[PDB]
Symmetry: C5
Subunit: 311 residues, 5 copies
């Protein structure tokens, strides 16, 4: 095979769409291999711009078609240069811009760790004809940087693996294993916006529904409760606008469901108290003092939900 | 005719849009046929990358144009390679990315079974000039995998049929029947998100409107009812944001309409009771005990709606 | 001129967008004419695929550029084949995919009849140089089929007309009249979704506001009314999300305005009754019995609004 | 220079987007000039379709690149024909489809006059090398026609001006002035949809808040007021969905702000009356009769807001 | 190296999207350098239009590929001309249309200063082979002009820097430093729309919740408060529709959170007063006079929030 050394420079990561779990990566790819020696005007390396690589390929020069595996749509290719050397080494540099997809797990939604994956692979040549010798990813432009709500933590881990393709087994009998480069850039979500923007109003709503226990009249303890209940219920599709329609519950929507149960338990408790308060004064010392025992219960539920993340 | 053996490798299925009933399928297609023997540099199969297939077709090599029938828009074609053999067999491999449409039935919306269909057909040649000998679809990448809310269950059933085209009957008198490959991938919807996200809040709303019967004062039994009624009524267009504007009712919207009827029957019953309660105490033993008979009625209605699916 | 016989096969009609009154039509177009006799390899008709029609046109073969007049954007052209005969007849088949616009009238919105129009015309040649001899549209794939909410009723009426172009009068002095093919496919909207999804909740709301007359206390007859009034008022922009911002009123929004007037007349009537009820018991036998005369008035208004459609 | 006579046929104007103040114009452009005489097959004018104009330009024929100045994105060019004459005149006809931008003023939003502007200019040649002799715009297809909510009033005024470009002053020392054609099509907005859809519900809301003065109990005069106030306040972003986030106030949003002030003044007046009604019956003859003086004040405010438009 | 003198004419800046912090810039770029002298027809500079620059590059003419660094997507290139001189200077003019991204800081959202940045750089040649001699940006078309809500203040500051690329260090050992042009156009946001559209309704809401202290009955002082609280709480995602999901708080959302705290403190204060008002008249002179001390507290909080911007 031929040894192709790749350098991926990530200019920027933007447009991290969690609805379809895609992220737009812009950058440059530099694939360098060695071939037969050639003659150039002078002895400098010859630069062939875009549109002219086709003329050199029609002349007979071997240029591999490296593709992105985890891309959504076709990648936008900007300029591409082909830099040839007198000693015989060929360099193919190209600006890629692609919507790449990765399987993202949102079970811890505000406090979230994901990774952006770039999968690069020869389209035609298996590792018996093209082997990726090494890759260094030069992600210094976004190495420690918040893009929209994602901090980029750590370095980009680079792996070179080999993927067996069963669909090419009939057309290539015993050589269908393709060299592949995987670039992982770990990202940690910034939970600050959800903290001041959704956790805080829902916290004031839940605290206000704690406060409706401290009232004396039944005309205000049930109507308010119902207004606060339906206000929490209206927040059901908050994460489905940010994330997809996920089968699991995040932390935000579990807090919303805890709000459902809290206001519903409050409503049922107060309705039961007024129903047993029919045939007289009918006042017990326990229910009137349950105004302070209910926020403690919600705090215990919140703590036992956090403690799973804490361990 | 010539025997074209197809292999479709499905890399991923994503973007399953139920608004227009489309789904984006990315993959590779490998069509293999045999022609006259040819000479190549050495005796290895010769790989012709993209942009160079046109030169070989202008030279005179026969490459069929296989198209996708059920596609929305034009399919994005990534790289395409053409691998020629000394013994004469030609292989056309191409990365397709297409928005494909299938007729989807959403009469059982959360608990839903659909299928993703790929229809592949020669654009020009009928089965007297090009016959699909066989197809194997290598869908191992998504064989048992949840993509967004769809589990992929079972294998991809592959069929080769022949479609008669009446519009080509005048231009091709007695040979207008085209070979076609249909690939069906069955998918089952994950109902979990609708269970914790819409079934649960609507269940608490309906249970709270059961609970308003247990009140004593008329100032709270009608106002609450109306707030809960309009809260359920505001959920009318929930499925039309997920599905289209379907002429039939799903299970979610039938539950919403059952909510309409339940709160409306509650409101009418309580209004009638207070209207017949004009000229005295006017209390009957039946209406005051109908607080427990109404959730049983709603549970019976829910059970008889489920039992149609159960059989 | 030359006689060009067209066959339009409509594969599917999808994406019927009533916001900008466009609809996406996918299909095949087969234009057949006769020229000078030619020689082909063997005596079979020669099939020239895409990309190779340009070589034959550069050789000197006459291929007209047929365009779509009522298209939005540029039409997506898939594969195109050019099938030449030894006896001299030329066939140009091409897969078109276009967003076509038609002037749609939504004055009867749920109960709506529209038509999808395909306008096809030579771009360069007037009817002195290219005449459309006949067209048959093979719309058997969608002949009796509901696509999203449109039933396709009847056959596709095909017309061949001639359009005079005044802008080409200076460059072509007395021959600027172009042959044109118009294909009309009549469609009838399915009103079922609006019936169970918007007509039903608004009907229960209007019936509940009929029911608030049956109350006795003023604290409930005005507040409820106002809640139901603002609930109906919030439905003003329901059709503007489905249709455009139309200058006329449909049936849905006239029902919404009838709701406005009904709840407002109820509110004004009850406020006037309580204002004249100041200086005593002040009870008249007419207003207390107007609880049953108001739904009859709304039913009469609905009937006289329907009877215009009935005639 | 050479005299280029332009004819712009506007097929349709559609997609008038007031969010970014763009409008999609579809049409044909016919630019006619005269060159050296040439020989054609026979003596008829020779029609060169798309794809073949490039061959004639490579042969050496002068075809100018006319561009659109006020376009958003790149214009979609459909077919283009090049019609050459034996006497030497060259005609370039091309179907353009472009999103064009014009500076739109929405200070009178429902009752609005705008104009759609097409700016056409040679890309390379200044007026010393290419002068636009005349233009006639053949806008008979939309001459008196409502497209979405815009009536096209009057004819399309056509102007030929000359624009000096300072950026080309260094590369072209004393000849950087380019001929330009501006086509203005005046349009008047249809206010009907806003009249029956937003003016009417807001009018009933404001009239209902006039009607809450006629009540006797304080428990209904403040709560209702607040519900109607927040209903009007929820309509703040109505125009920002139709127009942009404009720095000025239209007529709709000034009516909304007048609603704000009216309900707020009502709320403050009633709260002040009940606060001064503390130490007794405390009833004055003026405030109880201000129920009729407040709608007169709002009508005077509306009239003095209209009278600026009236003059 | 060769000295390339650039002139960027900004036709318009439009589509300033603050969700992904991009802005669409349309304009012309004129890059002028000097090469070997050449012969042209006559002695005028020869203009080579689009499509023909490729023929001259294949002939052997050196045309650099200048790219935009901060672009989102691939830039739309309209017409491009190549104007050659007999004395040897080459001019490449091209209409660019690009979505450019800049890091925007929205910590002062209505009262906001940003800058639109155009970064231009040779794709292939480092500053040892191509140096940008100077740039003048001719932004007279938008020099003092409001586009959507941005005033363009000042001139466009132009800088020529040199960027070292580590990813090109292996392929170019000691010459990987590329010349770059950065064009900054400062823009100041127009806060007027947020002033009359969001600041004003929220101000009336906060003033109305000041006014609910002036009431006497507890049935109106808590329910109203809760309605106004939830009305303010519903405005949490106002800026996330305009800006992104920013980790920091702007001025609008800090005003919203101040609204949260104000209504919540009002609700808690009134609930505490009624809870301590259990065992008698229980009236203190301080709480009843706190109706006027609470808006002063909110004004002090607003002033101390403004005074950070004031310094
Ligand atoms: C003791 C101290 C005071 C406490 C009193 C108030 C407390 C009331 C608690 C409410 C629930 C608390 C749990 C909060 C978080 C719950 C959120 C949660 O865990 O998930 C949902 C559970 O379903 C649920 O909750 C459903 C549970 C019902 C929620 C409504 C509760 C109201 C109960 C009526 C009141 C009782 C009256 C007493 C009657 C005697 C469903 O996720 P899902 O399916 O995707 O799983 C699959 C996925 O996890 C992996 O694929
Ligand atoms: C007995 C125990 C207690 C029960 C008391 C409360 C129970 C009240 C029941 C309400 C309805 C229950 C059904 C729930 C599911 C109903 C949903 C449903 O089946 O579909 C809709 C039916 O229309 C409908 O419902 C319309 C039915 C009306 C809904 C409102 C009901 C309020 C009735 C006023 C109160 C009565 C007062 C008593 C007066 C004497 C329309 O689908 P569509 O057209 O697409 O078909 C075509 C498609 O199926 C195939 O193409
Ligand atoms: C008698 C039995 C009981 C009845 C009592 C309740 C009944 C109250 C009726 C309300 C209106 C009924 C009509 C319903 C349908 C009305 C809908 C309608 O026809 O259209 C709108 C009419 O404007 C309108 O309605 C505006 C009419 C006003 C609507 C509000 C009515 C409340 C009246 C205050 C209460 C009266 C108190 C009595 C005071 C003495 C405007 O379309 P537009 O411009 O595009 O035309 C152009 C286009 O048609 C062709 O280009
Ligand atoms: C006398 C008869 C009865 C009347 C009693 C009720 C009447 C109450 C009137 C309310 C306002 C009426 C004006 C209605 C239209 C106002 C709309 C308007 O003119 O624009 C806004 C004005 O700001 C405004 O209004 C702000 C004004 C405040 C609005 C709220 C008013 C409530 C006042 C509290 C009650 C008073 C209690 C009495 C206390 C002693 C801001 O546009 P903007 O910046 O883009 O300009 C730049 C742009 O114009 C050019 O670039
Ligand atoms: C004295 C005169 C009368 C006053 C009485 C009423 C006044 C009540 C004040 C409310 C808060 C006032 C602050 C208003 C602006 C606050 C907005 C703000 O500063 O930001 C948020 C602060 O969190 C917050 O506020 C959270 C604070 C809580 C908000 C709710 C307050 C209700 C308190 C319950 C009532 C007390 C009862 C008394 C009990 C004894 C979070 O930004 P974030 O994270 O992105 O930072 C990172 C970023 O800044 C840089 O990356």
């Amino acid at each position: 095979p031929v040894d192709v050394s790749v350098s991926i420079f990530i200019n920027k990561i933007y447009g991290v769409n969690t609805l379809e779990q895609t992220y737009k990566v812009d950058g440059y790819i530099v694939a360098q291999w060695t071939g037969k020696p050639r003659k150039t005007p002078g002895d400098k390396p010859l630069i062939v711009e875009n549109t002219q690589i086709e003329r050199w390929i029609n002349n007979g020069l071997w240029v591999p078609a490296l593709e992105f595996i985890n891309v959504v749509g076709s990648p936008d290719t900007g300029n591409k240069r082909l830099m040839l050397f007198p000693d015989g080494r060929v360099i193919y540099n190209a600006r890629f811009l692609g919507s790449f997809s990765n399987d993202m797990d949102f079970r811890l939604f505000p406090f979230d760790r994901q990774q952006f994956v770039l999968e690069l692979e020869p389209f035609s040549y298996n590792n018996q004809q093209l082997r990726f010798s090494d890759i260094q990813v030069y992600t210094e432009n976004i190495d420690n940087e918040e893009i929209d709500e994602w901090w980029i933590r750590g370095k980009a881990s680079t792996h070179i693996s080999d993927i067996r393709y069963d669909h090419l087994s009939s057309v290539q009998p015993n050589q269908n294993e393709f060299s592949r480069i995987t670039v992982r850039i770990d990202a940690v979500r910034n939970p600050s916006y959800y903290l001041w923007s959704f956790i805080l109003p829902l916290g004031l709503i839940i605290a206000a529904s704690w406060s409706v226990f401290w009232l004396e009249s039944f005309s205000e303890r049930l109507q308010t409760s119902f207004t606060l209940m339906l206000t929490v219920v209206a927040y059901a599709f908050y994460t489905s606008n940010i994330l997809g329609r996920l089968p699991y519950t995040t932390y935000i929507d579990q807090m919303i469901i805890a709000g459902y149960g809290s206001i519903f338990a409050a409503i049922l408790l107060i309705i039961f108290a007024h129903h047993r308060q029919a045939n007289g004064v009918e006042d017990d010392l326990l229910i009137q003092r349950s105004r302070l025992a209910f926020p403690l219960g919600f705090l215990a539920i919140g703590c036992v939900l956090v403690i799973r993340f804490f361990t």
